[PDB]
UniProtKB/Swiss-Prot annotation, chain A:
Coverage span on the entire protein: 112 to 196 of 255
Localization per Swiss-Prot or TrEMBL: Nucleus; Cytoplasm, Cytoskeleton, Spindle; Chromosome, Centromere, Kinetochore
Organism annotation: Chaetomium thermophilum (strain DSM 1495 / CBS 144.50 / IMI 039719)
Function (record text): Component of the DASH complex that connects microtubules with kinetochores and couples microtubule depolymerisation to chromosome movement; it is involved in retrieving kinetochores to the spindle poles before their re-orientation on the spindle in early mitosis and allows microtubule depolymerization to pull chromosomes apart and resist detachment during anaphase.
Official protein name in the record: DASH complex subunit SPC34
Subunit structure of this chain's protein: Component of the DASH complex consisting of ASK1, DAD1, DAD2, DAD3, DAD4, DAM1, DUO1, HSK3, SPC19 and SPC34, with a stoichiometry of one copy of each subunit per complex. Multiple DASH complexes oligomerize to form a ring that encircles spindle microtubules and organizes the rod-like NDC80 complexes of the outer kinetochore of the outer kinetochore. DASH complex oligomerization strengthens microtubule attachments. On cytoplasmic microtubules, DASH complexes appear to form patches instead of rings.
Taxon lineage: Eukaryota, Fungi, Dikarya, Ascomycota, Pezizomycotina
UniProtKB/Swiss-Prot annotation, chain B:
Residues included from the entire protein: 57 to 112 of 173
Name used for this protein in its record: DASH complex subunit SPC19
Domain of life: Eukaryota
Lineage start: Eukaryota, Fungi, Dikarya, Ascomycota, Pezizomycotina
Subcellular location: Nucleus; Cytoplasm, Cytoskeleton, Spindle; Chromosome, Centromere, Kinetochore
Coiled-coil residue windows: none
Protein species of origin: Chaetomium thermophilum (strain DSM 1495 / CBS 144.50 / IMI 039719)
Function: Component of the DASH complex that connects microtubules with kinetochores and couples microtubule depolymerisation to chromosome movement; it is involved in retrieving kinetochores to the spindle poles before their re-orientation on the spindle in early mitosis and allows microtubule depolymerization to pull chromosomes apart and resist detachment during anaphase.
C-alpha cells in the first residue's frame, strides 16, 4: 500500500524523523507538501477538515516560525555585538 | 470519481489513521521545535544580560 508520492515524501520523512531539535520549518516543508497531496486525495470528513485547517495554521505558523527564528538570530546578533564591545 | 473515491477511500479508512498520526506527530515535532526556539531566545536574553553586567 502507500501512495507513490506519499511514499516519496514518507521516504524523506523517515530519512529525517527527529534530526531537528530547534528550527523554524525545514523538514516540515516537505511535510506541508505531503499534507497537500493528502488533502488533495484524503477521505473522512470531520477528521479530514481539521487537517487542511491545521495545514493552513501550519502555513501561518511557518511564517511565524520564520519570524521566531529570525528574531532569535537578531537576539544572537545583539548578543554578539555586546560581547564584541 | 465521487462515488468511486467515496467507496474506495472509505475502504482505505484504516490506512488514513496512520496519516492522522503523521500529522499529529508533525505538530508535536514543531511544538518541541518551538520549545527549543524559546530556549534559544531566553538563552540569548540571559547571556546578553550577563555580558552587559560584565562590561557595565
Amino acid at each position: 500500500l502507500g501512495g507513490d508520492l506519499h511514499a516519496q515524501i514518507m521516504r524523506g520523512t523517515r530519512a529525517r524523523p527527529g534530526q531537528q531539535p530547534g528550527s523554524g520549518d525545514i523538514d516540515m516543508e516537505v511535510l506541508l507538501r505531503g499534507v497537500e497531496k493528502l488533502c488533495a486525495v484524503y477521505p473522512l470528513p470531520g477528521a479530514l477538515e481539521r487537517v487542511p485547517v491545521i495545514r493552513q495554521k501550519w502555513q501561518a505558523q511557518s511564517n511565524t516560525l520564520a519570524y521566531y527564528e529570525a528574531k532569535i538570530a537578531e537576539q544572537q546578533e545583539m548578543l554578539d555585538r555586546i560581547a564584541q564591545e | 470519481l465521487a462515488a468511486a473515491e467515496a467507496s474506495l477511500r472509505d475502504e482505505i479508512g484504516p490506512f488514513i489513521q496512520l496519516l492522522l498520526d503523521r500529522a499529529e506527530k508533525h505538530l508535536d515535532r514543531q511544538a518541541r521545535r518551538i520549545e527549543t526556539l524559546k530556549a534559544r531566545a531566553e538563552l540569548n536574553a540571559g547571556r546578553l544580560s550577563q555580558y552587559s553586567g560584565d562590561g557595565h
